[PDB]
Design an enzyme around this catalytic site. Structure first.
Site, mmCIF file in Angstrom:
data_model
loop_
_atom_site.group_PDB
_atom_site.id
_atom_site.type_symbol
_atom_site.label_atom_id
_atom_site.label_comp_id
_atom_site.label_asym_id
_atom_site.label_seq_id
_atom_site.Cartn_x
_atom_site.Cartn_y
_atom_site.Cartn_z
ATOM 1 N N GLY A 383 0.805 -1.202 0.000
ATOM 2 C CA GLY A 383 0.000 0.000 0.000
ATOM 3 C C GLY A 383 0.843 1.258 0.000
ATOM 4 N N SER A 384 0.151 2.397 0.090
ATOM 5 C CA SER A 384 0.826 3.665 -0.155
ATOM 6 C C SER A 384 1.739 4.084 1.001
ATOM 7 C CB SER A 384 -0.204 4.752 -0.499
ATOM 8 O OG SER A 384 -1.306 4.790 0.388
ATOM 9 N N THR A 385 1.760 3.325 2.101
ATOM 10 C CA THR A 385 2.843 3.408 3.080
ATOM 11 C C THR A 385 4.213 3.281 2.417
ATOM 12 O OG1 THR A 385 1.476 2.520 4.878
ATOM 13 C CG2 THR A 385 3.838 2.218 5.058
ATOM 14 N N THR A 582 -3.173 2.925 1.813
ATOM 15 C CA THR A 582 -4.288 2.150 1.301
ATOM 16 C C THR A 582 -3.808 1.374 0.091
ATOM 17 O OG1 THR A 582 -5.102 4.036 -0.018
ATOM 18 C CG2 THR A 582 -6.135 3.698 2.161
#
Length: 640
Positions: A383-385, A582
């Site tokens: 995810g965008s982490t 996300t």
């Protein structure tokens, strides 16, 4: 010598038939019953091998040093060393001797009882005595028990002391309402084929205080495996089950009466937890008096296993997922100690290791959220982490200027009209975006643009300094993380998507906690550790120290800024660096689109703890950040 080679062949085929457990085939290779030929008939030889080799669980007979001579014109002597596996261990260096008869066109064995065991004569018997080993315990970093051998209260009923007509139905409804069980379940239990009127029929294990017992109900204490955290650690610890005939066939050293690890650490550490069976395998005279002791040793109980897990962190982590699908990994990032490995939804391992109905098991296996999955060991798009990693790489190779501001108009962007309908999406329409702003608002368009600017070669060079492709030394079944399916993206879209953490990337939460530890060790990657005694392995210079000192103050802003995506954590009043993320998942089999929600958080002042949490296929308005406050308070108080 042609006949000597035929005799050696006959001995080899005899041994092979014995080793394959085809006793009749080996018996058919023996000469006729006489005093100078074979000592027993073929059926009696069959029965002797079946009886003795089955009593000792003999398996894996293999020979060596085979010599075959000639003693007469029809007799040829043979000898060999042999070893075999039994329920008491390996029988090594057995000296077998015998003779062969070539009394036609074929060569046979003059079978004597000393080709079962070497020192056997006539009608000698074999005796096996065994003492079962106690299964070792699994304990947390402070000695708290995670898997132990305890005393359990077995609730059951006796159908005779229950009643005839009317009193039976009243007492069944009473025992069903007092212990929360279906009345049809109690009747089906007492009506199974194995039951007799006076037998105690087991019903349920009681894991608390025992209420008043109606007529017919009774409690009996039984010893068995017990899991104190229960479902909170079921995927990590696993459960044990009854050993089956087929388990013993695969490994004779298992206790034909004990328990075997079926999943989790109970299975990965089954050899060290189970110990070794004690006892004695001996040959006795026709009147039971021991001639030779073949094997003997005392029982060795299982060694205890001590984990890095914190039992209270584990329970808090699991409870915070509220029965939704997700996982949580907590570490101390400077040593790699895994404090918590939580997966949700879960199953009851106590119910699993005792009596589990077929309906309840099918409810577990048919649950769409799949409680048997170890989510902390399953590969997901991070995810965008993952922006953090892409930023750090872009800072190391000079692609990204922290202060240069891209101009982004709207919520959708694409490189060129060649992308067709595909566009990178962001949630917040901020027009002037530098790195700090992209981290605070979790801006995928910024990251996609900077990834395309960096290019596949520089991006992969940065990514290859991590742990993609590596196998972590952990007793948890797990596939190595991957950047993509093949060694090239061959797609600008795939390169952009990977930049913000969702292309063909597959990283499980434990491998995520390893990669994100660079932000707690000035660019050094610290490999995670689950066994408390092991040494701290690490990997230096994965990202630059300048990149860490640029990104961590922005990660503090993700919490402190009023528009930061993790701002709800500033209520805690503790030093926090966080990043939210996300991932949108929609394969060919998916109805609509499903979203996964991620949280990464750690203490940037002392680096005492780190946490990665994810919610899989989140319900609307849910997020991992909403659920993290309690674990973060505990970790911050107990791990400085």
């Amino acid at each position: 010598t042609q006949a000597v080679e035929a005799g050696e062949k006959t001995v080899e085929q005899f041994v092979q038939a014995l080793n394959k457990g085809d006793y009749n085939k080996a018996a058919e290779m023996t000469s006729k019953k006489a005093a100078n030929k074979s000592a027993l008939s073929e059926k009696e030889i069959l029965d002797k091998y079946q009886n003795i080799y089955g009593a000792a669980d003999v398996k894996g007979l293999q020979i060596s040093n085979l010599k075959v001579d000639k003693k007469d014109d029809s007799t040829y002597s043979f000898s060999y060393k042999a070893k075999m596996n039994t329920s008491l261990g390996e029988l090594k260096d057995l000296s077998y001797k015998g003779t062969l008869d070539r009394n036609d066109g074929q060569t046979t064995i003059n079978w004597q009882p000393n080709l079962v065991f070497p020192e056997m004569e006539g009608n000698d018997k074999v005796s096996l005595t065994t003492q079962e080993a106690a299964r070792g315990n699994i304990i947390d970093r402070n000695g708290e028990p995670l898997a132990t051998t305890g005393k359990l209260k077995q609730l059951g009923v006796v159908p005779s002391k229950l009643g005839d007509g009317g009193e039976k139905t009243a007492n069944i409804k009473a025992i069903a309402s007092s212990f929360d069980l279906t009345e049809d379940a109690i009747n089906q239990a007492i009506s199974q084929s194995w039951v007799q009127p006076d037998y105690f029929v087991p019903l349920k294990i009681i894991d608390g205080a025992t209420p008043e017992l109606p007529a017919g109900a009774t409690i009996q204490e039984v010893d068995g495996r017990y899991y104190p955290l229960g479902e909170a650690a079921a995927q990590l610890i696993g459960y044990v089950g009854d050993i089956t005939a087929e388990d013993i066939d695969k490994n004779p050293e298992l206790s034909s009466n004990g328990k075997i690890g079926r999943s989790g650490l109970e299975m990965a550490f089954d050899k060290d937890l189970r110990g070794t069976t004690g006892g004695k395998l001996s040959i006795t005279d026709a009147d039971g008096v021991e001639k030779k002791v073949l094997i003997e040793h005392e029982v060795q109980n299982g060694k205890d296993i001590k984990l890095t897990i914190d039992a209270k962190a584990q329970k808090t982590a699991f409870d915070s997922l509220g029965g939704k699908a997700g996982s949580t990994v907590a570490t101390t990032p400077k040593t790699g100690d895994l404090l918590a490995l939580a997966s949700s939804p879960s199953y009851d391992p106590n119910k699993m290791t005792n009596g589990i109905s077929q309906e309840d098991y099918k409810a577990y296996e048919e649950n769409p959220e799949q409680p048997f999955i170890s989510r902390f060991a399953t590969g997901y798009a991070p995810g965008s982490t993952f922006k953090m990693i892409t930023a750090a790489i872009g800072l190391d190779n000079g692609t990204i200027d922290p202060n240069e501001v891209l101009t982004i108009n709207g919520l959708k962007w694409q490189k060129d009209s060649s992308w067709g309908s595909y566009q990178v999406t962001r949630v917040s329409d901020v027009s002037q975006v530098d790195l700090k702003t992209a981290l605070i608002y979790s801006d995928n368009i910024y990251t996609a643009q900077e990834t395309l600017k960096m290019g596949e070669k520089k991006f992969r060079t940065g990514l290859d300094k991590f742990i993609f492709g590596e196998d972590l030394d952990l007793p948890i079944s797990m596939n190595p993380a991957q950047i993509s399916n093949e060694d090239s993206f061959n797609s600008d879209i795939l390169l952009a998507d990977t930049g913000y953490g969702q292309g063909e990337l597959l990283i499980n939460p434990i491998q995520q906690a390893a990669m994100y530890s660079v932000f707690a060790n000035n660019g050094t990657l610290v490999y995670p550790k689950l066994i408390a005694d092991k040494e701290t392995k690490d990997k230096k210079n994965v990202i630059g120290e300048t990149a860490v000192q640029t990104i961590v103050p922005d990660l503090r802003e993700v919490v402190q800024d009023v528009n930061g995506t993790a701002h709800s954590l500033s209520a805690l009043g503790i030093p926090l660096a966080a990043k939210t993320g996300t991932a949108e998942i929609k394969e060919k089999q998916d109805v609509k689109g499903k979203e996964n929600s991620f949280l990464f958080a750690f203490n940037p002042d002392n680096q005492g703890y780190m946490m990665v949490s994810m919610l899989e296929n989140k319900e609307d308005d849910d997020s991992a950040t909403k659920r993290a406050s309690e674990l973060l308070q505990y970790l911050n108080q107990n791990y400085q």
